[PDB]
User: Fold 3C-like proteinase from Severe acute respiratory syndrome coronavirus 2.
Amino acid sequence: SGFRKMAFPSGKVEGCMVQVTCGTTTLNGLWLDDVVYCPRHVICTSEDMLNPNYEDLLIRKSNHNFLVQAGNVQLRVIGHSMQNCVLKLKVDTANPKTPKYKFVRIQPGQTFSVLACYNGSPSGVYQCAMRPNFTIKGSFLNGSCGSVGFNIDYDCVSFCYMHHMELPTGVHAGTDLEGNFYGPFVDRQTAQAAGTDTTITVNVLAWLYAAVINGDRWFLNRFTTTLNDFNLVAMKYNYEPLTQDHVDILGPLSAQTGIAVLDMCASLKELLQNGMNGRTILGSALLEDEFTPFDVVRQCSGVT
Amino acid sequence: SGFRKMAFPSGKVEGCMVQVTCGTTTLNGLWLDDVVYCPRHVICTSEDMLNPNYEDLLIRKSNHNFLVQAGNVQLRVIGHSMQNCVLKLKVDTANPKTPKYKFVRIQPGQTFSVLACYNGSPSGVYQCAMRPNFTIKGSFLNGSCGSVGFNIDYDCVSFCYMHHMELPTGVHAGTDLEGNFYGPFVDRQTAQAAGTDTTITVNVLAWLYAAVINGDRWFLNRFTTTLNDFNLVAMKYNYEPLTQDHVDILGPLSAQTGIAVLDMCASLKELLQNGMNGRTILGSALLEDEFTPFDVVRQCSGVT
Ligand SMILES: Nc1ccc(S(=O)(=O)Nc2ccccn2)cc1
Ligand SMILES: Nc1ccc(S(=O)(=O)Nc2ccccn2)cc1
Assistant:
């Protein structure tokens, strides 16, 4: 019993973190096989970041200008290429600690673990969600760029995020491991405003199921609703519209608890209209939306 | 910028987890040098747990009755001893992945990371606090016993917790790595009620400083207070009394922000008396108490 915001064990990713320095800029890289992946803005001065031409800046860089350090050992750079917003540095040594891995581009509302790093050294691990506006709400100081987000399926690490930017509003933007930004963001120090940070409805419903499984039941009510009726309420409260795909995904949690998905929607509708009245659910005074239905099943079933 | 509930990177502890089986009971053990540490209730049937005589049960066990598996390799048990509520199994092989480590007994209000494990396999990592009633609020299913709590100082793991029990109220109890329970709890399936779960005042104050550093400032007010006046309010709201030792510990955060500790106490006093009025601080609708002053400094300074 109990339900916690839980990250994946980080060891498999710790084994992949290195320091990348280009001139006076240091950040983190990800070493998988004989390639190190890092943000292309490693090549920028803070002055360059205001208006960078990355192809033109990169022409002034050679393999020997990229200093890659794995613990206290230097790696030899034998090639470099830019793919979208990431640099790929080819090194002469395969990472001996390379785990089984994939690169995946996640959808908004999907959760992942971040291993925050500075100078190639892990400092902490926490759980994030890709927000519906394609920002994340992380914890990143200067030097954290190139820290990665990931999920683990048994022994296979799926890398989904690399940290690139902090927006003027103090939320975070980055890329998949192909170097494509999530959302409309660019690796330039310019005005970039975020869209509406809507609540991830299917994740709130998952977390209410987690609450029932763990004995927090006060919010269960005598009502039901329809997807259309629920969605009028979601729209009013800046919640993502609920689709039949989301209802299907919540099927296992419905079956386990015996609470029909549309009944839990009616409980959520009442919570939106009435508030928490100073009560808590799983130690929260607000409706938590950074657990996916898969997260709730995993944590409630003890998957390793 | 941003502030997250952050766990320590778990790799150094993942390298220490093993499976311990005695008869039909399987749980987790911690392998450090040539010793495996696990809960002594590994020797109990569920029937035994109602009223166990551990010395008498242990007489019926030999070294060969303790099956220790490290990944898919069996370790040879060459001795066993009971120390308080933990078994120490001496094996013939030192763990090659043994990190620098210490055993520490933490004080209530101190935070630590838990690596939740099943069958010796890590499933997740999250951040806990030793509550003032000597419970923790974890996420532990059947098979999680012997999962450990720890802090890391650079390269040295300080182990502070091993999981033993779930109370009938669904909160958690365990031991330090000398096998001494935190609080009054025992490794028996009997009525054990928890005392008041008071709020860890010094940690709330730390988190309000974290909020100011990260730009959440709406709760700062025009008032100050005294320790005695603040403490009358703390008592009313089931908060731990604030001591001059706590004021001293918050000194660096006071200095960084320029907000005198007693001024932040007066902001906290108003929040207790007035509530949040539907507002949030660092994405929370309640006052968070599972960050220590050291946690806030570490996360805000990027210590690796
Ligand atoms: N929000 C935002 C998005 C893209 C860019 S740009 O660096 O592509 N530069 C551009 C884009 C359009 C017009 C002029 N410069 C800058 C800001
Ligand atoms: N809450 C609590 C604490 C200790 C015990 S005991 O297993 O030590 N057994 C005892 C203790 C006192 C009287 C009888 N049995 C049981 C319950």
